[PDB]
Amino acid sequence: PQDRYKAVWLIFFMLGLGTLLPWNFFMTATQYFTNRLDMSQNNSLSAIFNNVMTLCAMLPLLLFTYLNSFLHQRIPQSVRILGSLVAILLVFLITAILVKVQLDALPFFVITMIKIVLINSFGAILQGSLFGLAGLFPASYTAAIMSGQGLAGFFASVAMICAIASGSELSESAFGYFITACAVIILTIICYLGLPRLEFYRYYQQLKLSIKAILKKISVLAFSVCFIFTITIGMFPAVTVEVKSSIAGSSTWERYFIPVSCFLTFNIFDWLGRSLTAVFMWPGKDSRWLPSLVLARLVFVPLLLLCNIKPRRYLTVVFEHDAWFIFFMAAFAFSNGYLASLCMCFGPKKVKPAEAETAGAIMAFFLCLGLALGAVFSFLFRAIV
Ligand SMILES: [C]OC1=[C]C(C(=O)O[C][C][C]N2[C][C][C]N([C][C][C]OC(=O)C3=[C]C(O[C])=C(O[C])C(O[C]C4=[C][C]=C(N([O])=O)[C]=[C]4)=[C]3)[C][C]2)=[C]C(O[C])=C1O[C]
User: Which residue spans traverse the membrane?
Assistant: First the structure.
């Protein structure tokens, strides 16, 4: 029970990074997908790309985390993890190739949406299998995955900012995104392959030798994490990206305000929140404070909705100064990452070892369910207003 050189922990960190960095990079290239559609089309495809991507992403993600939650035992973990990684690698490679070939708007749209469905279908399997596997190890090792995911968001924000500041065409920035993701997926595979020869890994993984009952034991953390991401995705990014500066001195702020004050703030403090859990896990797996703080986050809905959103037609700006928005985004993002990591770490520990794997898989589904519910609410809000 001694992780020498913290090798297994570092590999779990890299697994987390490898799970989300590609997808995150994909999301950050939305400007490339919509702009490409605009320069190609001669109700529009770019006007619907975001919403159709949300559907092509959240439906497969939710379906396959569900199926994995009750079918993971039938497929070896090495197959589920390494096959999902190789599939995603192949998809992102193709995504990079399409940047350099000429294609009409509608085929590009359709093919990109197909690739999005695959990314999130194999992603679901890969994410559900990783949290299941981490369910056999101490809680710190689920925090490793969460922390590595947080780093994936931070890197995505650095990449977005650097891309704007470079002055390069959106297509070549996006080609860099996709090639980077391919390299990261290859590094993730290598790291995963190094686990079986580590004694610490075999110690907890040798523990392999009633879904309704398991769900009853983790229901508090499962619904908590679902509510975490319902709130988060209900406000971020679709709603928060519409905030405008009120103290800008220069027109140069315009193209940077959102990627800095919204995306960077979020991914910095969400990453840090997830990272703190590997060393500090208050309030504890049995404390009723964790669901209570998850509930209290509901305050951010009015708070952020009453920030300086422009154009606005129905609500008033109660918090106009950027400092309000950045402060709310930091707290909004820190509570998300910190409480989400706690729920994912503790969930598997509410159950016996021979069920921790399944518990982790279920926790993954509820996380994704949160995401899907968030996407719905934001849409329903925008569809009514
Ligand atoms: C939010 O975000 C973001 C974004 C950005 C941008 O650009 O916008 C654009 C995009 C748009 N959209 C699209 C999509 C949709 N939606 C909703 C949702 C959001 O959410 C998300 O998706 C998530 C989550 C999360 O958790 C964090 C997750 O996990 C749990 C997820 O799953 C998936 C996967 C997994 C795995 C994989 N494998 O493994 O492979 C793959 C894949 C997801 C919305 C919309 C930017 C940024 O920065 C840079 C950010 O941040 C990072």
Answer: 7-23, 52-76, 81-99, 108-126, 144-168, 176-196, 221-240, 253-271, 289-307, 323-342, 361-381
